[PDB]
């Protein structure tokens, strides 16, 4: 967890989305105490190095910055939200909400595919992508 940095103001969130031109900006929105927001914080931290060349990761806490709760509508322990060139990206995991991510993904590998898929599709301006594995059943 101490690998991955944290964002302590909503102004750290916004500049961080802007200044990274060439890579995804992946953010976990959720709060330290949570059962499920700790688990994801692991599965990302392990992956963050492998992917440094196309994706950048950060951590944010709903309690630290609540400014973003209404606009993106944040419910539940945590939401993974992908950004490329200020454009909110979007993917269908078969789960019935195409915005963000909720459920906890299981393998390191299946997580890297999703990041890679989003980036590759995203690079072409495509706003939707399809997660190869569709965990509607899972979540």
């Amino acid at each position: 967890s101490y690998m991955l940095p944290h964002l302590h103001n909503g102004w750290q969130v916004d500049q961080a989305i802007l200044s990274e031109e060439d890579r995804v900006v992946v953010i976990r929105f959720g709060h330290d105490w949570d059962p499920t927001c700790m688990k994801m914080d692991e599965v990302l931290y392990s992956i963050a190095e492998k992917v440094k060349n196309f994706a950048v990761i950060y951590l944010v806490d709903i309690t630290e910055v609540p400014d973003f709760n209404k606009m993106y509508e944040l419910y539940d322990p945590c939401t993974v939200m992908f950004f490329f060139r200020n454009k909110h990206i979007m993917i269908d995991l078969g789960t019935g909400n195409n915005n963000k991510i909720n459920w906890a993904m299981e393998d390191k590998q299946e997580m890297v595919d999703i990041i890679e898929t989003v980036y590759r599709g995203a690079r072409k301006g495509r706003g939707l992508v399809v997660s190869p594995k569709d965990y509607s059943t899972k979540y």
């Binding site: 967890s1 101490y2 059962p35 700790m38 688990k39 692991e42 906890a104 299981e106 393998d107 299946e110």
Partner: protein, 438 residues
């Protein structure tokens, strides 16, 4: 799925908050961050059951580290026990988790085995002198009575051996008969096999040399097949060793066939199929005459059972002597020597002092032979010889020389299928009473 992972994550964090407070003031802040690599390093060290120790490190630190590594190990191990039970039942889980859990259990099994082998040698002597002599003596009387003439060590000059070579090679190839994609070891193996076809005399010449010389080989790889109820050891071995052994196995059984040695009691299936063989056994029971009559308190007993952990108990030192009774000592010594080597699984290594791998091409032959020795121990000379018949004119699977010859003894029938023993006896009321009283 995330529980054990999460536990270790927070544990490390707690020590990190604690460590700066706890001590290591002299150590730099940058150095402290690496500390986590040693925690990882300690874990890495912990993994594979290898002692791990570094240079400049805190005492009031080493013990702390041990305490958290043990905590993670408990989490890890308990999870493994839980998931295996779910898998056995068929309970819905995870096909990833299915793979991860298997991985963790294979390391835990291997750790257990490595300690068991160590402890056997350290214990210093499972066999005992009285037992060893009993085993030896039994074998001697069997060989005496059976009248089989030892099987000579295979010659360069065997008409049969050249022909068998073909049979051995087919068996080895079968494993790659349908593979679209091969790895490097697979490619090497096939290359070797093609070379063997191209120049059989070199292949054969080298093989003979290996039997005569090489006493210490190279440990293979071990993996487990998950049958969701029991795990089965699968072995990966060097191709040169495998070809030589495959050939040898073909020879020996041909020699056994030609040279007899293995009685009709065993159930190899060379002549008869198992499902069908079971049926025949039922048919044989029906065929038994005077077998269903209970007018005077006659009783029949069917006993079924298994060897259990035969592999652990194989006597490398005993085995060699028993093989000398059968083959030229150079072959016996070769076979024995090939045995215990090194077993690897990632980080882990151990030396199989009393270990036999099922996955060898000629393992089957060894298992049948070793089982035969145990059959002599269990069966006894008086009835076992009656079942087998004389060495001049042996009986088939379920038959006797005469009705009198059957009647003479409680173990009228005897069947052995590798390690499975089947013995048929019918008791009179008086015989039954005797056994019960004793």
């Amino acid at each position: 799925q995330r529980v054990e992972s999460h536990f270790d994550l927070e544990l490390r964090a707690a020590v990190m908050h604690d460590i700066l407070d706890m001590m290591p003031e002299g150590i730099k802040q940058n150095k402290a961050r690496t500390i986590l690599q040693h925690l990882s390093e300690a874990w890495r060290c912990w993994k594979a059951n290898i002692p791990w120790k570094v240079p400049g490190l805190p005492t009031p630190i080493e013990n702390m580290i041990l305490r958290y590594v043990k905590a993670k190990a408990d989490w890890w191990t308990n999870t493994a026990h839980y998931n295996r039970e779910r898998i056995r039942r068929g309970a819905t889980v995870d096909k990833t988790v299915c793979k991860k859990n298997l991985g963790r259990l294979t390391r835990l099994y291997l750790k257990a085995e490595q300690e068991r082998q160590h402890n056997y040698l350290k214990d210093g002597p499972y066999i005992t002198a009285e037992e060893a002599v009993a085993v030896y003596t039994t074998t001697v009387h069997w060989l005496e009575s059976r009248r089989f003439s030892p099987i000579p060590f295979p010659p360069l000059s065997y008409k049969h051996d050249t022909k068998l070579l073909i049979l051995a090679l087919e068996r080895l190839k079968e494993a790659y008969s349908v593979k679209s994609r091969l790895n490097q070891s697979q490619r090497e193996e096939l290359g070797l096999i093609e070379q063997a076809y191209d120049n059989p005399h070199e292949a054969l010449s080298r093989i003979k040399r290996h039997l005569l010389t090489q006493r210490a080989f190279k440990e293979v790889g071990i993996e487990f097949m998950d049958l969701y109820s029991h795990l089965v050891p699968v072995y990966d071995v060097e191709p040169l060793e495998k070809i030589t052994d495959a050939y040898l196995d073909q020879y020996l059984w041909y020699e056994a066939d030609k040279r007899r040695l293995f009685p009709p009691w065993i159930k190899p299936a060379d002549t008869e199929p198992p499902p069908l063989l079971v049926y025949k056994w039922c048919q044989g029971i029906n065929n038994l005459q005077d077998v269903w009559e209970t007018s005077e308190g006659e009783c029949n007993v069917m006993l079924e059972s298994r060897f259990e952990k035969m592999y652990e108990k194989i006597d490398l030192t005993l085995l060699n002597r028993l093989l000398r009774l059968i083959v030229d000592h150079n072959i016996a010594d070769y076979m024995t020597a090939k045995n215990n080597v090194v077993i690897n699984y990632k980080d882990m290594n151990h030396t199989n002092s009393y270990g036999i791998i099922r996955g060898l091409q000629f393992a089957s032959f060894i298992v049948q032979y070793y089982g035969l020795v145990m059959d002599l121990l269990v069966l006894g000379l008086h009835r076992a010889s009656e079942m087998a018949g004389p060495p001049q004119m042996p009986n088939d699977f379920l038959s006797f020389q005469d009705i009198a010859t059957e009647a003479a003894h409680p173990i009228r029938l005897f069947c052995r299928y590798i390690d499975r023993i089947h013995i048929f006896f019918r008791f009179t009321a008086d015989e039954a009473r005797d056994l019960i009283q004793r």
